[PDB]
UniProtKB/TrEMBL annotation:
<dbReference type="GO" id="GO:0019867">
    <property type="term" value="C:outer membrane"/>
</dbReference>
<protein>
    <submittedName>
        <fullName>Surface-associated protein</fullName>
    </submittedName>
</protein>
<feature type="domain" description="Copper(I)-binding protein CorA">
    <location>
        <begin position="30"/>
        <end position="260"/>
    </location>
</feature>
<dbReference type="GO" id="GO:0005576">
    <property type="term" value="C:extracellular region"/>
</dbReference>
């Protein structure tokens, strides 16, 4: 591994390369929007707070699973539920090859004792070096010549958490470029495709109640479990493999007594750990150096 998941563009569609926003902080509602500052962690020792949806990270409500064909036995890599792109929250940073940093997500100071959050993340590298405008994708098909402020494209509405992610069949694009340094044999710049290269991912595996279980796959994400004895938080050391622009996705794993997905793919749970206030589930992402 890692697996590579290859999507086929379709607009309207799940894999329509929709735009994400780096300020939106309010929970999966509307609800009435809350926007904060853009979550740029460039320079590091930055920290931002925002709300994450109940099952966003490993999300049966997506009705979508993928499978990871790089796991032996392949049985162990199947029916991996996707995360939701838009009930997670997106951030970015610019950085340098070899940069040694530490990512921490934990319950927000003001929710410090409410049980619920089991944050996880995915970190991607975008060899294009910056936000990617692509005309004819979902939210850029109305004559736009640029991305809206504080926004960027991602492949689709339901995301893979342990794979390189490729979109193919895009409206032909003559200016799909990378900067001078990028090895375009390893990281090709296609007229009709782009890839989000996997960097790292993990989630908080510490339960609030040892008898309970996480809405999480039995085996496929074994390498991604993060255990530190503290429910509601994880920390992770990350060395940046490349110079340039990184895209960070953070979302939530839900703890339950039991859960089930019925024939019509409806999600049911019992005994949810979810003591979450009117304002929603708030976490704080900090990237520090070191
Ligand atoms: Ca933990
Ligand atoms: Cu979405
Ligand atoms: Hg919560």
């Amino acid at each position: 591994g890692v697996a590579e998941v290859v999507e086929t563009f379709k607009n309207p569609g799940t894999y329509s390369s929709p735009v994400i926003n780096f300020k939106i902080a309010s929970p999966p509602g509307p609800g009435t929007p809350i926007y904060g500052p853009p979550r740029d962690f460039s320079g590091y020792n930055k920290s931002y707070s925002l709300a994450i949806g109940k099952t966003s990270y490993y999300d049966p409500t997506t009705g979508t699973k993928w499978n990871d064909d790089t796991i032996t036995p392949v049985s162990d890599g199947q029916d991996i539920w996707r995360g939701w792109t838009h009930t997670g929250k997106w951030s970015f940073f610019n950085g340098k090859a070899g940069d040694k940093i530490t990512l921490s997500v934990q319950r927000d100071a003001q929710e410090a004792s409410l049980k619920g959050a089991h944050p996880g993340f995915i970190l991607f590298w975008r060899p294009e070096g910056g936000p990617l405008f692509w005309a004819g994708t979902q939210d850029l098909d109305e004559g736009q010549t640029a991305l809206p402020a504080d926004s960027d494209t991602v492949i689709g509405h339901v995301i893979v958490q342990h794979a390189d992610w490729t979109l193919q069949g895009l409206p032909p694009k003559a200016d799909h470029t990378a900067p001078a340094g990028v090895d375009t044999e390893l990281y090709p710049m296609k007229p009709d495709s782009y890839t989000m290269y996997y960097v790292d991912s993990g989630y908080d595996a510490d339960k609030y109640v040892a008898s309970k279980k996480l809405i999480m796959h039995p085996t496929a994400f074994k390498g991604l479990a993060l255990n530190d004895g503290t429910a509601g938080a994880f920390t992770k050391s990350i060395t940046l493999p490349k110079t340039g622009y990184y895209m960070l996705y953070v979302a939530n794993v839900l703890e339950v007594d039991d859960w089930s997905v019925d024939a019509d793919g409806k999600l049911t749970t019992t005994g949810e750990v979810w003591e979450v206030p009117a304002k929603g589930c708030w976490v704080n992402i900090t990237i520090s150096k070191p």
